[PDB]
Amino acid sequence: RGRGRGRGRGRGRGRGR
Amino acid sequence: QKIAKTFTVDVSSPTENGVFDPASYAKYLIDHIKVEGAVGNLGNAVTVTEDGTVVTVVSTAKFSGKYLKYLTKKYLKKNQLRDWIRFVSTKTNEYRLAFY
Amino acid sequence: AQRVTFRRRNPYNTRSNKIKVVKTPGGILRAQHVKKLATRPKCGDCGSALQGISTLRPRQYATVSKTHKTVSRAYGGSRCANCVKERIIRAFLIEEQKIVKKVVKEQTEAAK
Amino acid sequence: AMKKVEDGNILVFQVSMKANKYQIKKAVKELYEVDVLKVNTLVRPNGTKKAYVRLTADYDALDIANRIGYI
Amino acid sequence: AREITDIKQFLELTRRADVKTATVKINKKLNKAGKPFRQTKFKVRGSSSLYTLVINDAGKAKKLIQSLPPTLKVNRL
Amino acid sequence: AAQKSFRIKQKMAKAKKQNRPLPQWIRLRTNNTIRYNAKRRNWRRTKMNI
RNA sequence: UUCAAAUGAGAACUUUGAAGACUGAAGUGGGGAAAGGUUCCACGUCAACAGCAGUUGGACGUGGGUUAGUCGAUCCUAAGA
RNA sequence: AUAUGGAUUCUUCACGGUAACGUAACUGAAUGUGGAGACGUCGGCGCGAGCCCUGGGAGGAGUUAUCUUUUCUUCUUAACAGCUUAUCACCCCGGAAUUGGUUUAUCCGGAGAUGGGGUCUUAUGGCUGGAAGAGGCCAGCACCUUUGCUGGCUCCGGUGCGCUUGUGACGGCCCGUGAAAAUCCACAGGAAGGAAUAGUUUUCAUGCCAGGUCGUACUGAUAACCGCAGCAGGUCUCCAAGGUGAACAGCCUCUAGUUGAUAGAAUAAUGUAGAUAAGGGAAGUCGGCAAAAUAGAUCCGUAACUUCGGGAUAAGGAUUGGCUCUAAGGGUCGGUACGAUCAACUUAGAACUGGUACGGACAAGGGGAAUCUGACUGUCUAAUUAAAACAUAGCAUUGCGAUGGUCAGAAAGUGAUGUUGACGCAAU
């Protein structure tokens, strides 16, 4: 929703390959 | 070209109560009026006369009614009299001292 | 050190919302809405403002008298007073030229 | 509204929404046999119309206001 | 809001069959550089404008008051 | 606002008269089930949307 | 922010006085447009609301208030419909 | 609506001025013409208004150990009316080179300058009326009280690269030249109507009547609007005091407005925000990330390279307070020569002085040597990617001469380019 709770796009965080 | 103006102060009201002296107040104006700089230049410019109940000031030099009130207010503060004596004007250039 | 506000409902600085600061007899500063200034009438062909005519708003020209909107000379409130004198030389000379050209045409078929 | 009667010489009435200033001036002029100087009207926030009827100097508002009956 | 300078034209305005109220105003003014004088202002209320006439001489001030018609209501000061 | 048409002001007058609690004497009637005004409107909680 | 007084069952928060401060005039000033719709004002009230408190309130209850020949709409036309 | 007065008419529909044109008035239909409405932006200059600053004087208040003819405050004039008033412009006289006039800014003159004498516009200003009777500042009285009553003063000036704003005459800019209509007026025109015992004009003056309908309170925002709300978010505009300074910067104060954000007691760790550190000076780190240093003004000095315009505040140095003085830069008045008087912050210079400090707070560029890349200004992924991506000027190609090119629509007596025409439009 907001600027927090980030899970999807990522530079080196989760949801990679 | 330099016609003089006469300033009269009514001193009858405070002297009936005994708290004011006209002779002592008249001498205070002699050694405190500044003409052309410092004090002591009353060269036929300012004269102060009194008859025991009213003080008359006749000046031909630069002497306004605000300077007379300014000097009178300093005299009352020296004698601790700025809490029963006011310097009001009944009309133009004619002042009085209200005791109440 | 006294600020003033608008006197009407329009809050924008448009061309019809000019403000002049006026000191009132009450001793306070107060805004006064002024009208848009009138433009002097112009001549029909030279573009210069002809003299002798008052400069008013068009609909208040119907309230002023006759002498403020015209000049006693012909073509008074329309021309530049040198525009009139220019079309008199042209009106007199051309009609004088048009009749001396008619007798030159008469010279042709009468002698060929 | 009653404060305006004694000093302003102005009568306050409730007026139907369809009436204009000509009809208020005409109706007051003959229902109370008075002369009307000017009529001022407004629409109250409850949906009714309130009119300020001012009488001329020949008549007074106070001695006519109690003639209807209200005071 | 109009000023009248002629005293003969002023008397014609008082008999215009519509003016009902006239006012006389006494103004305490002073001359060029010396003594104060008594300035008077005779104002006549018409139907579209207020005509006024100012006289700086006290000799002619009293003379004009008796010349006014008595049907005109004069309001002193 | 403050420069509005008559149709907007006519609807504002009806909402002012409807802003009233339930009268006290209705609750004493026979077979009465109304206990409070359920259609009460306030400018701070619900906008009337003109 | 502090002190005193007043009101009240009850006062760190209400009111008044005094003191100390801030917004520094592209303002926390004075007015309007859009928008809101009685929040404006007075009196009475403190169950709920004002994420503490409350005698106070944009709260609750009851009433009062918007006056135009000159200010606007109304009229004209623009992109357009 | 009409009346009264005026004006005109027996030369029927007015006179004056050489002229520009002037007046209290001083017939004008059909139709035609013209003007106003009606206009960009920037730049300096002139003028006006309000504010700021300031002198004298008349009142009130503050301070007074000492000093201070002191500090603060009041001294105001609306719409409208009459008279008058200017830059520009125009008229008459006159005939210019020994060329003259003239703006801050170089334009004007035998297509008639300079000069002399006039005309007009009335933004604006001035005087008077409105209008002191108002409002304001004080004093003297009355007194539960509806509360007033009586006296006064309200005056005369100065200054400007000042601030805000209005306006005037100009100049710069465009392959950009920067709305329309309602409405009002004038002119051309001569259709009609008109005098003599009498008529006409309500564009001259005065007098009479009427002017309807709807909106009108308040907020306009760290509480009245939109965000689930009494949310540090979002939301258009007007008015703008003093000091410091280039400044609507920052900082302090006046008018005005708030003192509202749950408090109290202590001062552990770890935090958030702000800071300081001896010696070394990037050894830290993917990486000078972060922080520090530099900073205003004046003077000196300034390279390679270059499209010759730049680079450039290049780089690199010095000075800066206070106090006492000196010099220079003006306005106005009577004369064919000089004084008198009055009013501005600008610059330069010299002594003295200090714990060597002085853009003392605030404010305020790190720089240099090269490579890759895009020419530059500009634009985009609202809420992870601002870039070398897009756009751009330039360059080149293609289609089309209207029964046409490109594209739209179910159709259509339908459209866009096109209010267009190859120096154009359309496609790359």
Nearest alpha carbon to residue B5 among B83, B68, B61, B50: B61
- DSSP for chain F reads --S--HHHHHHHHHHHHH--PPPGGGGGSTT----S-TT---TTT-----
Nucleotides of G under 7 A from a protein CB: 25, 29-39, 58-62, 64-68, 71-72
Q: How far apart are CA E58 and CA B85, in angstroms?
A: 45
Tell me, in Å, how far CA of C29 is from C1' of G74?
Answer: 34
CA distances (Å), D28 to each of B18, C84, D34, F5, F26, in order?
75, 65, 7, 29, 40
Total structural domains within chain E? 1
Contacts by B76-84, CB closer than 8 A, 24 or more apart: B81/B19, B81/B20, B84/B19
Nearest CA in chain D to F7: D47
Q: What are E39's strand-pairing partners?
A: E27
Q: How far apart are CA E22 and CA E14, in angstroms?
A: 9
Q: How far apart are CA E18 and CA E46, in angstroms?
A: 7
DSSP code for D9? -
With vertex at residue C41, the alpha carbon angle to CA C38 and CA C45, rounded to the nearest 5 degrees, is 150
Classify each residue of B76-88 as buried b or exposed e, where b means 16 or more C-beta atoms within 10 Å of its C-beta.
beeeebeeebebe
Q: How far apart are CA E45 and CA B77, in angstroms?
A: 59
Q: What residue numbers bound the domain in which E52 lies?
A: 1-77
Nearest alpha carbon to residue E5 among C47, F11, E13: E13
Distance from CA of F8 to the nearest CA of D (A): 12
Helix, strand and coil in chain D, % to nearest 5? 35, 30, 35
Nearest CA in chain F to D45: F13
Cβ <8 Å between D46 and F13: yes
Q: Using an 8 Å CB-CB cutoff, list chain F residues near D45.
A: 12-13, 16
Do residues C55 and C46 lie in contact, with contact meaning Cβ atoms separated by under 8 Å? no
Residue positions counted in chain E? 77
